[PDB]
Structure 1
Amino acid sequence: EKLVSKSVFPEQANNNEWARYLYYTGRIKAIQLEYSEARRTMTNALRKAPQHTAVGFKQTVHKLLIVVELLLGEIPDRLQFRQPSLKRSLMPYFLLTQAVRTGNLAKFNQVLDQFGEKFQADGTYTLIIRLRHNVIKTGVRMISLSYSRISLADIAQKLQLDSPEDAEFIVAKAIRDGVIEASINHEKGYVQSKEMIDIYSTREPQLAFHQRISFCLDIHNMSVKAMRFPPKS
């Protein structure tokens, strides 16, 4: 972590060396607690790898991406799992997600135990353990997305929890983490989700399009620079 934080990656490398740097930085973050940046760097890497070869590399990044997203309370998409190059290499993770959605600690324990040595071999076991105590998070994010205001007692009923104070506390910690956007108000006893703000009216669109325009002009300058007219070679 110190080494990476101190040296600077040159901005002109291959696709492959960029992919390797990105994988290692993603792994190092995921091992620490900055999940979101790890997710982002990983997806950049997977989007920068060679298309055809590197079956093992794709396997590596995909399994780590699955684990990190799960750790983030989102649900990774099912499209990949049936891809031929990663079908049988992720069955552990397929069962794992089937478990994380319909959270059943019995099923989570069954799958972790059975496919245990494999997880350890991958080099992730620690993270899947970090998940096992965060299975609730998916449910609370779902409850927030679905409801614009719910009573805390309703949350307790929905999460198969003990007295509604436990759910109260979990929701408060969540909103603290930033996974959900809401505001708790117990004097009536309901957690209230925050409205939707208009992104366009702000200045975000201008910034995004400016960045992309700069990239395009740079592409052009490079492209016309690369030309060599050697007919007088």
Structure 2
Amino acid sequence: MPYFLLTQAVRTGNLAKFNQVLDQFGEKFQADGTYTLIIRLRHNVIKTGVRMISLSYSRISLADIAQKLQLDSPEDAEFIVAKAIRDGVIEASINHEKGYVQSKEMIDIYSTREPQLAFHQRISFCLDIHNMSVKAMRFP
């Protein structure tokens, strides 16, 4: 009941409920030893939507993300987007010439260059299963 209703308030843009259920269920947070969420998850209260928008949209104007994050200011919304790309939350870029915030490029060389860098571990893990099988085989 605390944690399911916690992420209930996180997904919506409501902070008054977020502060209410902190006050309601803080003593349960005392038993779990997790006081520190209130100081470090209020960061992601504003950063969850900008992760959600930049995954949905592809080439957005900063004048429209202000009302969509209900921040009512385009001038600091540059800085929230600047902090998220600084933290590597979204890989996107900003056009600071006429107000464009565009996302990344298309699906990349993922079909060509990547998959052997997953395949090397799976060779090495499965033959070690074959090695650990054969070495521990014959006790009689």
TM-score, normalisation: structure 1: 0.57
Moved over 2 A (4+): 196-203
Q: Match for residue 191 of structure 1?
A: 101
Secondary structure at 1:216 match in 2: helix
Higher relative contact order (CA 8 A, sep 6+): 2
Coordinate RMSD, CA, aligned? 1.4
Distance 1:112 1:172 in 2: 29
Q: Deviations over 1:87-137 (max 9, x none)?
A: xxxx21100100000020111011111000111221111034310233011
- Pairwise CA distance, 1:155: 0.5
Q: Deviations over 1:54-109 (max 9, x none)?
A: xxxxxxxxxxxxxxxxxxxxxxxxxxxxxxxxxxxxx2110010000002011101
Q: Deviations over 1:133-187 (max 9, x none)?
A: 3301110011101110111110001111132112111001111111101111132
Q: Deviations over 1:189-215 (max 9, x none)?
A: 121111133243443211211111110
Q: Is 1:115 the equivalent of 2:25?
A: yes
Q: What stretches of structure 2 of length at least 5 have no aligned partner?
A: none
Question: Quick one: which of 16, 28, 38 aligns to 1:106?
Answer: 16
Distance 2:124 2:54 in 1: 38
Q: Match for residue 171 of structure 1?
A: 81
Q: Match for residue 3 of structure 2?
A: 93
Secondary structure at 1:200 match in 2: helix
Contact 1:119 1:125 in 2 (8 A): yes
TM-score, normalisation: structure 2: 0.91
